[PDB]
mmCIF file of C-alpha atoms in Angstrom:
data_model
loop_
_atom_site.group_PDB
_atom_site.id
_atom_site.type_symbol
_atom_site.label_atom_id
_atom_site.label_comp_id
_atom_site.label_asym_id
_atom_site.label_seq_id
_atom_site.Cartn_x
_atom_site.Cartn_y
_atom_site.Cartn_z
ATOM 1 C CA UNK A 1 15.043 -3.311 13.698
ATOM 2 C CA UNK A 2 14.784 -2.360 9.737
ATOM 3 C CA UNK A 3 17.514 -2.971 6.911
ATOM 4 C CA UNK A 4 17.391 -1.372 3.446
ATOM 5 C CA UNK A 5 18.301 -2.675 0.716
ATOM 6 C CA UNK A 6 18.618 -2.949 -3.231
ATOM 7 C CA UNK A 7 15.478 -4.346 -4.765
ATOM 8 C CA UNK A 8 18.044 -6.874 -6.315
ATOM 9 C CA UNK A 9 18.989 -7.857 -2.901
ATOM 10 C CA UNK A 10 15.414 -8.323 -1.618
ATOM 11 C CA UNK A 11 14.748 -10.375 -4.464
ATOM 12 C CA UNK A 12 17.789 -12.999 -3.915
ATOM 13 C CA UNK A 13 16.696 -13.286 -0.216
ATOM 14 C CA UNK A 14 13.304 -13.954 -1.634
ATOM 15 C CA UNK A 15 14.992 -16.538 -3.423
ATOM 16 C CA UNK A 16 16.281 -18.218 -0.400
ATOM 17 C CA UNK A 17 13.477 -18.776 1.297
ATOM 18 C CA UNK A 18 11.574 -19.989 -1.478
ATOM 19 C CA UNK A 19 9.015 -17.252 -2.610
ATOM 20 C CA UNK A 20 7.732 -17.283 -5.897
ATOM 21 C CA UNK A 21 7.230 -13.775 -5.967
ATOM 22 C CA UNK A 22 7.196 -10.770 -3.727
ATOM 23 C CA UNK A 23 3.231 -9.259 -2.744
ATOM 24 C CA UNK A 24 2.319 -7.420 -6.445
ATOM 25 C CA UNK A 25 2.268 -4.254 -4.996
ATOM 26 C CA UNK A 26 5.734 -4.041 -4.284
ATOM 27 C CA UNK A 27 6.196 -4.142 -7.553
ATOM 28 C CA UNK A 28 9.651 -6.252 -7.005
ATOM 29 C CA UNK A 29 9.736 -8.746 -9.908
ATOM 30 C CA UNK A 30 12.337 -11.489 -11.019
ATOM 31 C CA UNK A 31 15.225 -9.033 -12.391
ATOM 32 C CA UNK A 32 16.710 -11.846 -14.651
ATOM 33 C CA UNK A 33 15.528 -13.976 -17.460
ATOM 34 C CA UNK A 34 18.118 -16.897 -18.097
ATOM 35 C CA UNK A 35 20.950 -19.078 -16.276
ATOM 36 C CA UNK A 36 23.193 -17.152 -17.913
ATOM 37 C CA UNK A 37 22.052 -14.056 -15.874
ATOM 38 C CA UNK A 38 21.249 -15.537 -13.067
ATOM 39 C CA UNK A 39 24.505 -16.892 -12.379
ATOM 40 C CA UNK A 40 25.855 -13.099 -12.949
ATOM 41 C CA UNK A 41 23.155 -11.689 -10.968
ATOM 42 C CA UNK A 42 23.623 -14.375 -7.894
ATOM 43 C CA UNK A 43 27.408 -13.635 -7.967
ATOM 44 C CA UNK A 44 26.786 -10.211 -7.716
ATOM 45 C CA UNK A 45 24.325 -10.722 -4.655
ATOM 46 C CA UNK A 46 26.611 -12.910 -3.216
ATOM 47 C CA UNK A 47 29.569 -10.676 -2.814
ATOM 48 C CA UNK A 48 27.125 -7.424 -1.843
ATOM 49 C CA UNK A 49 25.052 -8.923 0.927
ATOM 50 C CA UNK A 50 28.702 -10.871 2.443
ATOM 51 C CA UNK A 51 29.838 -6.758 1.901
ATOM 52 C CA UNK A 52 27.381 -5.903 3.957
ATOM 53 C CA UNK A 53 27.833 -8.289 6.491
ATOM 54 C CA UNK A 54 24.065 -9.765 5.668
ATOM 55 C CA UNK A 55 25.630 -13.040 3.873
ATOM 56 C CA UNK A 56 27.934 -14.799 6.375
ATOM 57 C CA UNK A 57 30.498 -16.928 5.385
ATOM 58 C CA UNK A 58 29.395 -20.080 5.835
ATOM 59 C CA UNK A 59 26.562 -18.936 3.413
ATOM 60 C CA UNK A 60 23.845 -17.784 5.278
ATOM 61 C CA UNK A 61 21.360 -14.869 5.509
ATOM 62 C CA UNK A 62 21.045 -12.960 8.817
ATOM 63 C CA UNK A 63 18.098 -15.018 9.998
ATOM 64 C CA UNK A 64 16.376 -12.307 11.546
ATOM 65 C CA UNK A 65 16.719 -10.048 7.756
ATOM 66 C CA UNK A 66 15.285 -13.509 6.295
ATOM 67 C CA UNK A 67 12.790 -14.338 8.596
ATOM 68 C CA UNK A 68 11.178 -10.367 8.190
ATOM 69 C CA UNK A 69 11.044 -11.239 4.162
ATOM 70 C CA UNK A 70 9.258 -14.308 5.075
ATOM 71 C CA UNK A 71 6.548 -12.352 6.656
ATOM 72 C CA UNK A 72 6.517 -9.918 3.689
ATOM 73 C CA UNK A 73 6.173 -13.007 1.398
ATOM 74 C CA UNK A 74 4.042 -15.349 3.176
ATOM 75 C CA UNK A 75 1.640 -13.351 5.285
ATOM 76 C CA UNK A 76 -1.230 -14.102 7.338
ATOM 77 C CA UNK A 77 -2.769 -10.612 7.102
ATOM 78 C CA UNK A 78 -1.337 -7.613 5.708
ATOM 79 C CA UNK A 79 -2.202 -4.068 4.231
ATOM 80 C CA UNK A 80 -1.089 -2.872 0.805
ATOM 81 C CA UNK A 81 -0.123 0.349 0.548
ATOM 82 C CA UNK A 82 -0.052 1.901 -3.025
ATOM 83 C CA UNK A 83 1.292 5.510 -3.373
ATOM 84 C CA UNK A 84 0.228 7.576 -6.492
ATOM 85 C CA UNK A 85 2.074 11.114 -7.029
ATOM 86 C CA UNK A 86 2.208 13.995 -9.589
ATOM 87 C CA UNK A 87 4.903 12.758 -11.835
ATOM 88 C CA UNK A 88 8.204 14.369 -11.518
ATOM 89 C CA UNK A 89 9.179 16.902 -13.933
ATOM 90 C CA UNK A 90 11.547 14.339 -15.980
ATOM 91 C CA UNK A 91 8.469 12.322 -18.389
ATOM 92 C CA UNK A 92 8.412 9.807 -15.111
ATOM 93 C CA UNK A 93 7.029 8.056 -12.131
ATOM 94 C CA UNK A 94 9.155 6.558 -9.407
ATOM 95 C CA UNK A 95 7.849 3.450 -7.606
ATOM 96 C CA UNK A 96 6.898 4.250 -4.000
ATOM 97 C CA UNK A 97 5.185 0.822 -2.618
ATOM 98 C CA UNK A 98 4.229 -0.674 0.237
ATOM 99 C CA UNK A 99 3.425 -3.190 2.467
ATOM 100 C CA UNK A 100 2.628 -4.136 6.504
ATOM 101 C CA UNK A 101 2.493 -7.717 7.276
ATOM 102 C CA UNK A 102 1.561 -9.126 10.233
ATOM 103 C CA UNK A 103 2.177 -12.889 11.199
ATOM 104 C CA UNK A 104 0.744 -15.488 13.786
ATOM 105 C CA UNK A 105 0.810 -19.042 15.372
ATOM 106 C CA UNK A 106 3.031 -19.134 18.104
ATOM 107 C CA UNK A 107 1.451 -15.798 19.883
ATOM 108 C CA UNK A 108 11.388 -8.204 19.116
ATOM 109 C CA UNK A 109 8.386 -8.381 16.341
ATOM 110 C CA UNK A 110 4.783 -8.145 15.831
ATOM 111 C CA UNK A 111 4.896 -7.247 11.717
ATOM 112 C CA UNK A 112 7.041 -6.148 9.372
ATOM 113 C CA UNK A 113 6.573 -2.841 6.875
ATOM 114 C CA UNK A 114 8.254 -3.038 3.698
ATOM 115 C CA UNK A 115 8.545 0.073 1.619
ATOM 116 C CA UNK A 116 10.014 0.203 -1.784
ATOM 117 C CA UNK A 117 10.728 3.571 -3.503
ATOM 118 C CA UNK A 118 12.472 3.542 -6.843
ATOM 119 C CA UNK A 119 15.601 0.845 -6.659
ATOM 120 C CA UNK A 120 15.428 0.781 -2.748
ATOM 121 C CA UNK A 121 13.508 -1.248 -0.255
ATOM 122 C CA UNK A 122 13.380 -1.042 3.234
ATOM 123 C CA UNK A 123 12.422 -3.910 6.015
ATOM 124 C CA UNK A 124 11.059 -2.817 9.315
ATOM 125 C CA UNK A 125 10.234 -4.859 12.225
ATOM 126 C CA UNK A 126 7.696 -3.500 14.592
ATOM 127 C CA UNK A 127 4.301 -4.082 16.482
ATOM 128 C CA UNK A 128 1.475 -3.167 13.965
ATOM 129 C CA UNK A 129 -1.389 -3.384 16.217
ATOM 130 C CA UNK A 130 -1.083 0.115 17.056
ATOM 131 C CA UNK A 131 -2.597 3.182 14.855
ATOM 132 C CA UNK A 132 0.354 5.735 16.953
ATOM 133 C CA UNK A 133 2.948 3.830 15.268
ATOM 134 C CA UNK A 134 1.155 2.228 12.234
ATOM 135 C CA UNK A 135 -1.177 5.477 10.895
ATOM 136 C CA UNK A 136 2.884 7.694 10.899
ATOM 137 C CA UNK A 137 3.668 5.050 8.244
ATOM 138 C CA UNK A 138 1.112 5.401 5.423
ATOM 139 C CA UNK A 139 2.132 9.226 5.307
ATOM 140 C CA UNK A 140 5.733 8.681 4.614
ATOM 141 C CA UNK A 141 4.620 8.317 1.027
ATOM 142 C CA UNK A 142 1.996 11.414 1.079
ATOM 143 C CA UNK A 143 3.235 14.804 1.233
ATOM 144 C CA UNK A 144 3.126 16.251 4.758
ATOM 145 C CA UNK A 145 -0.238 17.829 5.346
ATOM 146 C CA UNK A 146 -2.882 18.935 7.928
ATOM 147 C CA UNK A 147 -6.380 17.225 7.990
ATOM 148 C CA UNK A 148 -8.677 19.590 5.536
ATOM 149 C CA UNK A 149 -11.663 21.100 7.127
ATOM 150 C CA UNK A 150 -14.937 20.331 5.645
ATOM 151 C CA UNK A 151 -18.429 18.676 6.534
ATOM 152 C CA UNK A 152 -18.292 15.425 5.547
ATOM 153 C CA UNK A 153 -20.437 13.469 2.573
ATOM 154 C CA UNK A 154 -20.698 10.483 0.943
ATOM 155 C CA UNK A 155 -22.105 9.144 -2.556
ATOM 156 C CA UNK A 156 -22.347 5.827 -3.652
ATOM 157 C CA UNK A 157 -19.182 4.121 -5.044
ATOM 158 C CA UNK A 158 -20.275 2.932 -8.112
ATOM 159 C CA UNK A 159 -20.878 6.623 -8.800
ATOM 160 C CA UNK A 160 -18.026 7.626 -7.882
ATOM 161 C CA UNK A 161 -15.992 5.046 -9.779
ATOM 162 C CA UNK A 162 -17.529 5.830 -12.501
ATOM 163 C CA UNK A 163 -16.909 9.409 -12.718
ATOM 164 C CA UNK A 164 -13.236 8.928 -11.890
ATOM 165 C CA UNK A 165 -12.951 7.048 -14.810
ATOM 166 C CA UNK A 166 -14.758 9.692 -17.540
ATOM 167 C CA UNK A 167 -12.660 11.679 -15.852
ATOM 168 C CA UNK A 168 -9.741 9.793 -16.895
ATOM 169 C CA UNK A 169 -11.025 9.194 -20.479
ATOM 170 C CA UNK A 170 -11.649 13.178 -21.077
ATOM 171 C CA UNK A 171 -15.048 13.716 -19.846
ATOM 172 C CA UNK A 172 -14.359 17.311 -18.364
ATOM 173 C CA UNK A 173 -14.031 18.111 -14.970
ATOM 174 C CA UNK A 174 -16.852 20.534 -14.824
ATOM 175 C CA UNK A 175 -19.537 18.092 -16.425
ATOM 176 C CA UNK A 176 -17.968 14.734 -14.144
ATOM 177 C CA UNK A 177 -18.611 17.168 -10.906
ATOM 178 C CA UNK A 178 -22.242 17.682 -12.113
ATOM 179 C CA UNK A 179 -22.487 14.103 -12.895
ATOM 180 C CA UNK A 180 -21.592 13.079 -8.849
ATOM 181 C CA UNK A 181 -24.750 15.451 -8.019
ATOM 182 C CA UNK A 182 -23.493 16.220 -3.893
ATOM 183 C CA UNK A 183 -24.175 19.579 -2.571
ATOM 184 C CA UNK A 184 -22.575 22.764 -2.987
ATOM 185 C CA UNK A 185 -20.611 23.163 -0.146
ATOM 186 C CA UNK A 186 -19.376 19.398 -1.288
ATOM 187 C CA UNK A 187 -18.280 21.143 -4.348
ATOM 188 C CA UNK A 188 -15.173 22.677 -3.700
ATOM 189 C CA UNK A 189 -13.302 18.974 -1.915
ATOM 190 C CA UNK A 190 -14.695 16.318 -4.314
ATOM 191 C CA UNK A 191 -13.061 18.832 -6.890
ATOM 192 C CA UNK A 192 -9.846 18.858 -4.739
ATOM 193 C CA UNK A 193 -9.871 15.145 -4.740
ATOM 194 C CA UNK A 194 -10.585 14.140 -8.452
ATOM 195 C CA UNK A 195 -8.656 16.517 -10.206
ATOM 196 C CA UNK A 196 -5.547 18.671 -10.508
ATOM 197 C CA UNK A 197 -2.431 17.398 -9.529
ATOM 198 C CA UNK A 198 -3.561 13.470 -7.992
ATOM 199 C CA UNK A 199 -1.612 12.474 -5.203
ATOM 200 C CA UNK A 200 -2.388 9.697 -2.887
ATOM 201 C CA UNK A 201 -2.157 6.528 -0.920
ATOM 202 C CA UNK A 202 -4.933 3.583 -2.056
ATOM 203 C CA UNK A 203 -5.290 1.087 0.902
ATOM 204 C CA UNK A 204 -6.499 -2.412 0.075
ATOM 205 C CA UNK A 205 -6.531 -5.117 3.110
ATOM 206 C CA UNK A 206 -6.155 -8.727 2.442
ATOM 207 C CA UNK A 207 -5.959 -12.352 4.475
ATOM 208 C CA UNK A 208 -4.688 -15.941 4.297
ATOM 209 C CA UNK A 209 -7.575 -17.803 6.095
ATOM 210 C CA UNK A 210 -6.452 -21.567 5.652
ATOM 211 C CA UNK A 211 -4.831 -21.705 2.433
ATOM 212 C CA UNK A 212 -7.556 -19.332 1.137
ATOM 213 C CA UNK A 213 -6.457 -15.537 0.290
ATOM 214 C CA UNK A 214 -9.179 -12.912 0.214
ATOM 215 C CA UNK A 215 -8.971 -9.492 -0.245
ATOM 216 C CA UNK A 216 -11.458 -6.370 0.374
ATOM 217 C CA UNK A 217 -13.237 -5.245 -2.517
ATOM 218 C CA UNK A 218 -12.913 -2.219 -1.684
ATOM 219 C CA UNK A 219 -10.483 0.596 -0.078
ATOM 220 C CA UNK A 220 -9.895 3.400 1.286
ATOM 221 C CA UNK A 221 -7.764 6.132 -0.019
ATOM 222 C CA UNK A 222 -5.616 8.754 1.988
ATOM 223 C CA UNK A 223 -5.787 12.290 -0.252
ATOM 224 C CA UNK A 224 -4.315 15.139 -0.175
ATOM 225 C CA UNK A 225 -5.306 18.650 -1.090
ATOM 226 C CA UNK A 226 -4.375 21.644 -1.737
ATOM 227 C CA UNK A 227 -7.360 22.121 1.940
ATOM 228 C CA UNK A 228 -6.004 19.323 3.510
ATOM 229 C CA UNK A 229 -5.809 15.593 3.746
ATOM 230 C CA UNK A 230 -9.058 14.201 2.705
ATOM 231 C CA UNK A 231 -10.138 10.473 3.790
ATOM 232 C CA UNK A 232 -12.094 8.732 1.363
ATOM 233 C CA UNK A 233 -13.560 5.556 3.240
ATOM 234 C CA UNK A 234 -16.026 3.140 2.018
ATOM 235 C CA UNK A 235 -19.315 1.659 3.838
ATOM 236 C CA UNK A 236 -22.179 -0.686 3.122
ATOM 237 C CA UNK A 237 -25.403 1.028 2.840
ATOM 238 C CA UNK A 238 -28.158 -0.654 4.656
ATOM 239 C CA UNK A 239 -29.535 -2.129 1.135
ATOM 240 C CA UNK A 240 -26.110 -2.991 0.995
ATOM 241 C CA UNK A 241 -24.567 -0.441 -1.956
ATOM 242 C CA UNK A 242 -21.572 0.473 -1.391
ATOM 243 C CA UNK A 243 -20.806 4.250 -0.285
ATOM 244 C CA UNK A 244 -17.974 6.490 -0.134
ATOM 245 C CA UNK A 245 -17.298 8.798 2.608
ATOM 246 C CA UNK A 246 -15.163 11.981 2.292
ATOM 247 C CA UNK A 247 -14.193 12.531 5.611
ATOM 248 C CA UNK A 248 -11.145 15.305 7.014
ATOM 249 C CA UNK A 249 -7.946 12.942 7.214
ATOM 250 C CA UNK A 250 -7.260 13.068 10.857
ATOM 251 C CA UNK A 251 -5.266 10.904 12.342
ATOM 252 C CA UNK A 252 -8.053 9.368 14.438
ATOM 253 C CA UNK A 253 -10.524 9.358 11.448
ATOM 254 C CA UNK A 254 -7.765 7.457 9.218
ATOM 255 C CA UNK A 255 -7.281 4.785 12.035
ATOM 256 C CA UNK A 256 -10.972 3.640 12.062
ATOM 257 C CA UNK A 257 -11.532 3.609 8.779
ATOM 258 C CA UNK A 258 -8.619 0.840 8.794
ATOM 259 C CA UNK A 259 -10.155 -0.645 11.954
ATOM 260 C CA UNK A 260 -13.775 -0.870 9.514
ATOM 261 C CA UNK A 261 -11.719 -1.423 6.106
ATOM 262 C CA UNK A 262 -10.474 -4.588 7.726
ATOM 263 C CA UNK A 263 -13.396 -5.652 10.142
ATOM 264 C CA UNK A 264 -14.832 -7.138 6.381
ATOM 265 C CA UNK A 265 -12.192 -10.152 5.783
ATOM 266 C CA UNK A 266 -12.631 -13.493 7.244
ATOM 267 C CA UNK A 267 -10.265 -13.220 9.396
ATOM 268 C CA UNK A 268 -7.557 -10.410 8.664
ATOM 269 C CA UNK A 269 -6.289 -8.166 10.853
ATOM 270 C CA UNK A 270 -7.518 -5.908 14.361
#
């Protein structure tokens, strides 16, 4: 029920079925530039996928590998899954990506998860529509953790946006924390969340009503702290700003806030 595989294989599979690209998070782009390497590249693909036992000889793809990267490339609904980490102690960031991608029209398979980290990528075929099975897969990428313990609070996004970025641009931590203005006791997570070491997963939900692709305009983001996992999820105010929550990550907590994160699109996801 999954396969993993080279980026360079996913990519001449994506070829086959006649995707222009793989979903931008994945970050999996067209590895050649010219006929000249394509034809090396495709050679190459051709003999490790038939090594694998993927590429049959008659020239085909294992339908069922195929028809998963359809659903990765072509979705109807689907959840992007963008993993942030403290660089590693070499000058660089690896690539940890993902995706879940859910398909319809004729309701084995439900959706398919795709996770890329550095050169690898790996397929899974599963039923999405449940948080005991779907919430375990966002924390592959996070670093195992306990929900933090805290009273929740909320400021307005915009706010919050905001200070992330002076943050980024050298506004110190100390003055950005007054800027937010929450409460003491607030204090100590918001801290926990903006600065230090920043490691994360940013959720983003997105649709293909008709031929029509929307996307949320806002998401959520999975955090974890040195107290805990911290949920940061996002609500319209009743004048209709938007507001962020910081919430304790349970497990429970993390799968309504995808239940509500989606509930926005057209027609994406349950």
């Amino acid at each position: 029920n999954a396969v993993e595989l080279t980026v360079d294989n996913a990519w001449f599979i994506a070829e086959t079925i006649g995707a222009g690209t793989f979903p931008w998070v994945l970050a999996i782009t067209m590895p050649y530039s010219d006929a000249a390497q394509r034809g090396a590249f495709v050679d190459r693909q051709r003999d490790e996928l038939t090594r694998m036992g993927l590429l049959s000889p008659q020239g085909v793809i294992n339908p069922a590998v195929a028809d998963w990267i359809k659903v990765v490339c072509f979705p109807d609904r689907w959840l992007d899954l963008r993993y942030v980490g403290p660089a590693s102690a070499d000058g660089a960031c690896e690539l940890l990506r993902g995706i879940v991608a859910l398909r319809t029209g004729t309701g084995t398979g439900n959706g398919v998860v795709a996770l890329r980290n550095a050169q690898l990528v790996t397929f899974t075929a599963m039923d999405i529509d449940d948080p005991r099975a779907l919430v375990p897969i966002l924390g592959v990428g996070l670093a195992h953790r306990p929900p933090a313990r805290f009273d929740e609070f909320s400021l307005p996004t915009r706010v919050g946006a905001r200070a992330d970025e002076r943050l980024r641009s050298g506004v110190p931590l100390g003055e950005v924390v007054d800027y937010l203005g929450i409460p003491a006791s607030a204090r100590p997570v918001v801290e926990s969340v903006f600065s230090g070491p920043r490691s994360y997963v940013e959720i983003v939900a997105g649709c293909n009503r008709d031929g029509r692709h929307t996307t949320t305009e806002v998401g959520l983001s999975i955090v974890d702290t040195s107290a805990g996992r911290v949920l940061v999820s996002p609500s319209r105010a009743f004048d209709g700003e938007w507001v962020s929550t910081f919430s304790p990550g349970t497990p429970f907590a993390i799968a309504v806030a995808i239940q509500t994160l989606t509930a926005c699109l057209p027609d994406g996801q349950w």
